[PDB]
Write a protein that holds these residues in place. Sequence first.
Motif, short mmCIF file in Angstrom:
data_model
loop_
_atom_site.label_atom_id
_atom_site.label_comp_id
_atom_site.label_asym_id
_atom_site.label_seq_id
_atom_site.Cartn_x
_atom_site.Cartn_y
_atom_site.Cartn_z
N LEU A 37 -2.93 -49.77 -34.48
CA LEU A 37 -4.34 -49.83 -34.85
C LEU A 37 -4.83 -48.50 -35.39
N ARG A 38 -4.44 -47.39 -34.76
CA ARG A 38 -4.85 -46.08 -35.26
C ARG A 38 -4.26 -45.81 -36.63
N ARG A 39 -2.99 -46.15 -36.83
CA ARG A 39 -2.37 -45.96 -38.13
C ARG A 39 -3.08 -46.78 -39.20
N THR A 40 -3.42 -48.02 -38.87
CA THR A 40 -4.14 -48.87 -39.82
C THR A 40 -5.51 -48.29 -40.14
N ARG A 41 -6.21 -47.80 -39.12
CA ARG A 41 -7.55 -47.27 -39.34
C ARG A 41 -7.51 -46.01 -40.19
N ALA A 42 -6.45 -45.22 -40.05
CA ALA A 42 -6.36 -43.98 -40.81
C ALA A 42 -6.31 -44.24 -42.31
N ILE A 44 -6.74 -47.45 -43.95
CA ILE A 44 -7.35 -48.66 -44.48
C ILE A 44 -8.40 -48.32 -45.53
N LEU A 45 -9.25 -47.33 -45.25
CA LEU A 45 -10.35 -47.00 -46.15
C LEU A 45 -9.88 -46.39 -47.46
N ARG A 46 -8.61 -46.00 -47.56
CA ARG A 46 -8.05 -45.49 -48.80
C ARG A 46 -7.08 -46.46 -49.46
N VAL A 47 -6.58 -47.46 -48.74
CA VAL A 47 -5.66 -48.45 -49.29
C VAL A 47 -6.40 -49.68 -49.79
N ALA A 48 -7.33 -50.21 -48.99
CA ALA A 48 -8.00 -51.46 -49.34
C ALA A 48 -8.81 -51.40 -50.64
N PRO A 49 -9.65 -50.40 -50.89
CA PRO A 49 -10.63 -50.51 -51.99
C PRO A 49 -9.99 -50.83 -53.34
N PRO A 50 -8.83 -50.25 -53.69
CA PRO A 50 -8.20 -50.69 -54.95
C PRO A 50 -7.80 -52.15 -54.95
N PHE A 51 -7.25 -52.65 -53.84
CA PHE A 51 -6.75 -54.02 -53.83
C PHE A 51 -7.89 -55.03 -53.77
#
Lengths: 74, 440
Positions: A37-42, A44-51
Motif C-alpha cells: 500500500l505504501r509503495r502504491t501510494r508513493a 500512484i499520483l505520478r503514474v495514474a494521471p497519464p493513463f
Amino acid sequence: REFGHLTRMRHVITYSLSPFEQRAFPHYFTKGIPNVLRRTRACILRVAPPFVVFYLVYTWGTQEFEKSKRKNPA
Amino acid sequence: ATYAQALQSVPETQVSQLDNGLRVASEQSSQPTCTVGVWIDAGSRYENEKNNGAGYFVEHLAFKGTKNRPGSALEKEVESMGAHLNAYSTREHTAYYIKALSKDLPKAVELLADIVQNCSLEDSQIEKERDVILQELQENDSSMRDVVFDYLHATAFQGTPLAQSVEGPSENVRKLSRADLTEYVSQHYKAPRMVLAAAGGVEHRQLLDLAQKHFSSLSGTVPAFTPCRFTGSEIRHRDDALPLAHVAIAVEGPGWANPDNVPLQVANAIIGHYDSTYGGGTHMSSTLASVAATRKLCQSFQTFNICYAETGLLGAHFVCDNMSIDDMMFFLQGQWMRLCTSATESEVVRGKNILRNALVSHLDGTTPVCEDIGRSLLTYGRRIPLAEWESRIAEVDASVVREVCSKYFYDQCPAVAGLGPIEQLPDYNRIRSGMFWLRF
C-alpha cells in the motif's frame, strides 16, 4: 571487475543467517500488505494521471468516430 | 619397551574427594619440581549479560593481594621461592597454577588457599584494574586471531551465554562494582566446582593432607548453564585497511563427552596445519597444505576442535590475502567432503599417528600434565589414561571417519566469521552449497 578488488570499504559489519534456519515468508501478509500500500501510494499520483488521460481520449475518440458516421436531417 | 609397554608404564592419576566436594587429584613422578593449581568451573558461559566480564575481573584481582597476604606480599612469596604463579580463564574454565619446587608444595598450596578463598577485592585496586582491563581490551582488538574467534563464537551461539566473550563488553567492565565481583566469587568458586590438580614430584597423600588443612573451610557439601543453540550465521567485518583477511568457518561439533571426538580429531589431523615459514611445503601429505604451498594461497591455516560441555565448534581458520579467500574456501570444503565421502585407509593411518603424537607430546612437562588433570576431572569427570586414548584411536578406521564426518560435516549449516579485506569471501549461499556435493 571481479570480486576482490571492486572497491575499498571499512568499519562495516554485516550479520546474516542460514536459509535453513529462518522462514522464507516472514510476515508475508502482515507486513507485505502495508508495504504494498505504501509503495502504491508513493507512485500512484505520478503514474495514474497519464493513463487516465489516455482513457479519456480513448473514449472521446471512439465515441466521436461513432457519432461522426451518424446520418445527418441534412 | 614397544610403545604400548611405555604407555602402560605411565604413572596413574590418583583421585580423591574431600568432604567439601574438592576433587583432589595428583600424578606422582620423580621430577624435583611440581605444578599445583585449582581449576574452577567458572567462566563466561556461566556469566549473564550484566555479569559478563566479572570472571576476567576477579581473575585479574586474584593475584593482586589477598586478605591474609596484603598486596605485593603475596607476590613477595611467589618470587622468593622461585615459584611462577599463572592464571587463565576460558569461557568455561578458570585456573590459577603455581609452578614450584617439590619442597615448596606445603607453602604453594597455602598460597592457593589464600587466592581462591580469602581474596581482597580492594575498591581502589578495582579502580586501578578497570583501566588496565580497558587497555587490555584495546590490545586484544588488534589481535586479529582472537577477534575472529570471538566473532565466530558470537555468530555461532547468538542469543546464548556462549556467545559472550571472556573479557566482556567495555560497558560491563566500567559498570562492574565490588558487589558484583564478590557475589560472583561467592556463587561460582564453590568447593564442588573446584579440582585441586597437582602434577610432578608431589605425593598424593601429602596433597590430600595439605588440601584438608587449607581448603577445609570452603563451601558446604546454582548456575548449571543452559544448553546453548548453534545458529549457522556469518559476520563480515569488512575492513580493507587490514593487511590480511582472517576467516574462520565452523560447524556444530561434539562435546567433551560423545566419543565421536576421537575420530573427529583424526579427521582434523588429516587436514593438518600450515603457514608460510614451514618445512617441506609442497610435499606435506595434507592436500590442503600442499596446494597452499604450491600456489601460495595463504600465510596460515589451522583446524580447531573447540568443544564445550554440551556442544562445540569444529572447523578451520585461515589467514590469506584479499585475492585468495574464494580459492581456499573451495579447497577447504573440497578436502572436507573428500574426507566425508571417501577417506581412504592410508590417510586414516596418518591421522591416527598424528593424533597419537599430539596427545603424547602435549602431555610432557609438569604444567601440561597438571592442566590435563584439572581439565579432565572437570570435563570428562575422569583423567583418561593414555592407554584408553591409544585404544580409542586404534578403533578408528576409514569407515568410522567417513560416518562421523558425514554426521558432522555433510549438508550442515556452518558459522562463518571473516575480518579484514574479505570482499572475495563467497556469500553464505555459496558456502552452504559447498557444504554438499552434487556428485555424491
